[PDB]
Amino acid sequence: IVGGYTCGANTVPYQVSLNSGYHFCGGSLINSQWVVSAAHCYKSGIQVRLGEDNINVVEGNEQFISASKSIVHPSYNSNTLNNDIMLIKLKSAASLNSRVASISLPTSCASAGTQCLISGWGNTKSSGTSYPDVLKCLKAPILSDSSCKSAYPGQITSNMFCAGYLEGGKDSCQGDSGGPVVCSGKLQGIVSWGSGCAQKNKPGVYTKVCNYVSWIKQTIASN
Template structure:
């Protein structure tokens, strides 16, 4: 089994809230339950003009990892957040000093959108301050991830589909990874080895709009980022698609070290 990103990885649908307009389904957690407060201190919220639209994962005091399709001109980052309708005093707020999108990602300016290489690093200003509510998540050390692994996806995305209902607190859902060949048969010519597939075994349980960029945790390590999927969310036999973090370990480390 290959280690630390040596797995073969090749060099596609989004999951954003409706207020951003006409994009493919972005991910939220459908069929989950409220995450335990403080149990996921690496989970961050991304805001655009005071509207939550994506999530991400804190890698260290300076960097957040999220999906490239979450790129916006003015991104606000909230750390240590749980109930977005109230303030606890544990929250931290940063702006994005620099957003670095994977060079292989194709944006929507041409009218086409590819979910290949759907990954982006955000450099925080000011840096995060570690507390019991703000902590980094570990990157994978064992790659590739064995199929059939039970993982947890989380976020503040819609809890209903196709109608959208957004919760004030993050939702967590345990889902199982799906073999790539099975996923490719479900989504012909869209799924590559740079993606992970998970869920689809139970009706009504999935990530969905508003969950984009959020973490897929397997063995308490960051193996995936919510990327895209079918709409409406939660269809039986239709897994969600996640950016395969194992395929980008070298890019992540090189990028962070080079700034």
């Protein structure tokens, strides 16, 4: 997160860290045994880390649970990043409380101008590299489809939306991938991609979760 603020310990209780010896992607807990992330975060041997604030210090609220199954969207295209969404099933159910909680899936697609909360442990600099140990937060609006397509000609599908600031300075970044975009208490986006971080006229691009609710529910009900 570039240009954000320190969330505070366990203020984002649905935020998860994906760990394969090290943090490499974020995700969102959608019920006691399933996590949603980005398909481009896929790898084998994932451990899901819940209740994290400082990912380098055991602080007392963590739950470490290995993944038993990963399901990349059947139509994921790594060349275009279309359908950049993935489901992860935990080997055992997490213990839910005030500091570890699931986030609700949307019943409708959010509109441009809606203010959302984006979070992650990603890079905090636009020209440089500095990774934080504690969770960072960013409030950003959803941008209109026309401004999104004008910023990324020929690259925005119906499964993507832009959020952020066209003036730059505030954006998600590498290491935030897979993390949540929450608007009005519902998961509306997944950190997907962008050209650099926090660059002028290059806002962040996010997976449009509302298009995948039926696939998520059907998959969870059968796995």
